[PDB]
């Protein structure tokens, strides 16, 4: 059930990365402009996209290792695990500590405007 | 810091960062696209811009410590030292290591097309 599986995983991964960022922003957000905050949310979606194949390699081996028929809920749980086990807070700290949060551009707004279920992955 | 001094520093810093990137690329650039390489050259300019206030305080201290009035040759030297010693390699490793090199955008090509002397910084 391929796309139901991709959708629940994307929702959980983005949700999880977004939780890390919103938590981080409560501590560090004072210093950043609203555009810089939106850029970091873009970063979350882009990070998921550029690591999607690696997450799928790994998810494929975890389902396989179920010795069981995968239900969509398996995918929900594997996505939630990626969402909390990727250290995005390190990434925010490094990027902001290097003063290199990129400018908020229309192409970033475009990605942020999609529903999480529709964020394109390959 | 006066305009003439600003200009020799931007030239030397961008040149130094560019040399560091050119070096790093020999090791780490085999599988990047031309686009991705051009983004890291943009990153060098952007890095200088966002660290400009930091470099200006460092420069002020170095100049206070010179033991004589400063002249443009001192600023050329300090810009070259920043160009050499900032570690752009830890930043290039971070972007490439995480597969987060940004796409090459039109605004980036615009910044890359300026002469280093004309890259805007907050110094006016």
Curated annotation (Swiss-Prot), chain A:
- Main location class: cytoplasm
| Source organism superkingdom | Eukaryota
Q: Which UniProt keywords apply?
A: Cytoplasmic vesicle, Fertilization, Signal
Q: In which tissues is it expressed?
A: Sperm.
Is Signal set as a keyword in this record? yes
- Give the stretches traversing the membrane: none
Q: Which GO terms describe its cellular component?
A: acrosomal lumen
Q: Which GO terms describe its biological process?
A: single fertilization
Disulfide bond annotation, renumbered to this chain = none
Subcellular localization(s) per the UniProt record: Cytoplasmic vesicle, Secretory vesicle, Acrosome lumen
Q: How does it assemble?
A: Monomer. Homodimer. Molecules associate into dimers and then rapidly dissociate again. Interacts (as a monomer) with the egg vitelline layer protein VERL (via VERL repeats); each VERL chain can bind multiple copies of lysin.
Q: What does this protein do?
A: Creates a 3 um hole in the egg vitelline layer through which the sperm passes. Does not have enzyme activity. Species-specific interaction between the sperm protein lysin and the egg protein VERL exposes a basic surface on lysin that may dissociate the egg vitelline layer via electrostatic repulsion. Plays a role in ensuring species-specific fertilization.
Instruction: Return the protein name.
Output: Egg-lysin
Q: Which organism is it from?
A: Haliotis fulgens
Q: State start and end of the fragment within the whole protein.
A: 29 to 150 of 154
């Amino acid at each position: 059930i391929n796309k139901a599986y991709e959708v629940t995983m994307k929702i959980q991964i983005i949700s999880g990365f977004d939780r890390q960022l919103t938590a981080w922003l409560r501590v560090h957000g004072r210093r950043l402009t609203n555009n810089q905050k939106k850029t970091l949310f873009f970063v979350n979606r882009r990070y998921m996209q550029t690591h999607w194949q690696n997450y799928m390699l790994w998810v494929k081996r975890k389902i396989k290792a179920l010795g069981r028929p995968a239900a969509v809920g398996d995918y929900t749980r594997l996505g939630a695990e990626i969402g909390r086990r990727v250290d995005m807070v390190f990434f925010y700290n490094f990027l902001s500590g290097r003063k290199m949060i990129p400018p908020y551009s229309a192409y970033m707004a475009k990605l942020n405007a999609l529903r999480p279920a529709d964020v394109p992955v390959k």
